[PDB]
């Protein structure tokens, strides 16, 4: 119930970050404060990664949403192996979701509004299943996340 709502809030955050990444309409409402902070911090990471891991990223292809989900889950499983969760690492999850979605679109003639939906879903599931309780204990998105990153 709380966990259900928590998953749905993570999903909306992921959707909005990935829409931002594909330069696609909000058009319903203005981003919340947490959305804006997330877009700023997660994008700085996407940028740093794509810049400084370019050689590593070039040595594989994301031909499918199926495969994006696979590479994402294995990179993420290995990242969080030590069991350490913090706000900074949580930001890297959104960012890598973004790196792959952008990889997917550059290899597709046209991905559909559906690709970014399916990616937002697997991003959200990982964050929720791996960090959802931690987020809940550390002030959630309005206090925790925003006060951490101004």
């Amino acid at each position: 119930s709380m966990a259900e709502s928590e998953l749905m809030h993570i999903h909306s955050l992921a959707e909005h970050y990935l829409q931002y990444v594909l330069q696609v309409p909000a058009f319903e409402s203005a981003p919340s404060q947490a959305c804006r902070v997330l877009q700023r911090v997660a994008f700085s990471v996407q940028k740093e990664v794509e810049k400084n891991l370019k050689s590593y990223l070039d040595d594989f292809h994301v031909e499918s949403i199926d495969t994006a989900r696979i590479i994402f889950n294995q990179v993420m499983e290995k990242e969080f192996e030590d069991g350490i969760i913090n706000w900074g690492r949580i930001v890297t999850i959104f960012a890598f979701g973004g790196v792959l979605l952008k990889k997917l679109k550059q290899e597709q003639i046209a991905l559909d509004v559906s690709a970014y939906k399916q990616v937002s879903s697997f991003v959200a599931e990982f964050i929720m299943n791996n960090t959802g309780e931690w987020i809940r204990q550390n002030g959630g998105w309005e206090d925790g996340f925003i006060k951490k990153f101004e």
């Binding site: 740093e48 290995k78 990242e79 706000w87 900074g88 690492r89 930001v91």
Partner: peptide, 24 residues
């Protein structure tokens, strides 16, 4: 080496996340 790739990405991301978390 796919291992080497997804290993080096994972570690860089943990490193950049941990850096982010302690930034001032």
């Amino acid at each position: 080496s796919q291992e080497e790739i997804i290993h080096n990405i994972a570690r860089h991301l943990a490193q950049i996340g941990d850096e982010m978390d302690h930034n001032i």
